[PDB]
Amino acid sequence: EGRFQLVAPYEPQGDQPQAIAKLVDGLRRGVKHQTLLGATGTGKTFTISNVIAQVNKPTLVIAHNKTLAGQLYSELKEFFPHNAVEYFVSYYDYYQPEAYVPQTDTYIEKDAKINDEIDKLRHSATSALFERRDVIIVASVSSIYGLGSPEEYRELVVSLRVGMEIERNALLRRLVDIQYDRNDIDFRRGTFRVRGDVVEIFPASRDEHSIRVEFFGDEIERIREVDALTGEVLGEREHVAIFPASHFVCREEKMRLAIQNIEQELEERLAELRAQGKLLEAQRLEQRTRYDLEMMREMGFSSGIENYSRHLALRPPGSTPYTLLDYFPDDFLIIVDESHVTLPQLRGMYNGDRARKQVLVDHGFRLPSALDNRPLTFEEFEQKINQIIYVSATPGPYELEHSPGVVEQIIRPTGLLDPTIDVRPTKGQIDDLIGEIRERVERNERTLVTTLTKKMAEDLTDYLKEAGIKVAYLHSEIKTLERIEIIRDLRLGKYDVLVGINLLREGLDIPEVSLVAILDADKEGFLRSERSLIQTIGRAARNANGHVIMYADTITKSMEIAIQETKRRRAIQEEYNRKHGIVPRTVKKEIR
DNA sequence: GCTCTAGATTTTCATACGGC
DNA sequence: GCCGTATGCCAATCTAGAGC
Length: 592
Ligand SMILES: Nc1ncnc2c1ncn2[C@@H]1O[C@H](COP(=O)(O)OP(=O)(O)O)[C@@H](O)[C@H]1O
Ligand SMILES: [Cl-]
Ligand SMILES: [Cl-]
Ligand SMILES: [Cl-]
Ligand SMILES: [Mg+2]
Ligand SMILES: [Mg+2]
Prior knowledge:
39% of the residues lie in helices and 20% in strands. The protein is an alpha/beta fold.
């Protein structure tokens, strides 16, 4: 039980308050699917926060990337400073999955490294849902990939209360059983130790805050929070729950039967493959499957154990995997940030995973039961939904098709206007641009350019430097850390222009940008779709002199729709401005 | 209708080796 | 067997075109 406490220095404004009211009505009435159509710069997060606070439900927000995810997490940390705002993503620094490519007859070995901090946050995410109700989890599609059952997860928690009767070494056993390691020398998270009559435990969800449990004989006299760094106390606890240090827990009891069932599966497919004269394939499967089974009878954990998931959980074949979704209560809520991308990405996750595994199975690398170790299908994602709100400036088909209408939110609280749009011929285009950029330089304004290919962006960048202009390029070859710099440098003014391809769109706040130039606008394709064009136009929406130049010789079906949608925004906006008598001011935003 | 291209994101229960 | 350490740049996915 709990209660969201929204904290903000502003009240809802513009299209916000009607949007808030409509979405909340929808939710109370029981509408499953809804769509917030929020123009860029209208403050959708904040709209959404109001909605969360009014309906008071643990909510999951799915983002399509870790940058955005990061930001939402940070934004919502500030809006809900007394509540459990949490983070859930892949915790792998690098990961390469097991795979076989028939076209090259190449097998690739699994390779992976784990980030400790994300692992921690994931444990802080799952535990949080069992302790309290005022929870928001900002997640990637990592939330449709498999976890161990949450009912098993909950039941293995070690409860610890003042007055409890409990033997010390039993507690130690139990901590061990739930994947805590003893460590006296190096007391980091996922560990415990003893110092006399006190047992120190470092929850799997914590970085800088240990639990210090003081014992009498078999009685816990007191329980205290402790700074990992310093060592001082930081609170007196009556009780505290220690959750497992892993989301999967194998238990010896049932591991035995699991092995029989695997060995039985092995025989049957080996036979099946020989019967078909796939003799090398059976040789493979035999060789590895037995090696893995060896390590499950000597040790507990074998390499790629996850392939034997469904067997080790003793569940029937074709079984749906438990995921984070199941860790929420039944009446939870889901927000889907940038739904037009996140949902396709979501749909796609299973397809890649299944394509990959079907091959490994076909060519004798893994058993058919490997395929039951998977993310959710989109169809299963749908059934797990309780209610949901797709947020996006350019909602895709699925959203529109499943939502009553849209809740629209085009009026920005700062009173800013969707930019004006010129269309110009490709003849002499880059000279046109160079001049047009120089004008912007003179008024301390910045310019974004998009092109269709990485090399065109680099060439253009080199020919821009050539003309005296200060510029850098920006595409996927550049590492995420360096990007933040590049952009920081643009805002600062080290650069006056930035040339990109497809990273100059959703999520990008730069109010120093007064101009956005979309080259080859007529070249139809994913870089110049209805939606892509609209999203790139938005980059100029955070400036009073915001302007967009599409360089083309024709006007495609997409440009048609973009010019109209924008035009329409600019009118409704300018109307509301003329009523309230507002003079648009460019977004004052701190750059460091 | 098949096959290829573009830029860009995400996901995946670490493990092979050696020296006790 | 039990440890601590060195180690990776390798897949298939998405949308929406081009070229035969
Ligand atoms: N009701 C409001 N009054 C004043 N400022 C607001 C309000 N709602 C949001 N803002 C501010 O406007 C800024 C821009 O909104 P933003 O979240 O970038 O829009 P979106 O992310 O939906 O495109 C935010 O940093 C936010 O602090
Ligand atoms: Cl399930
Ligand atoms: Cl060019
Ligand atoms: Cl050029
Ligand atoms: Mg409206
Ligand atoms: Mg945003």
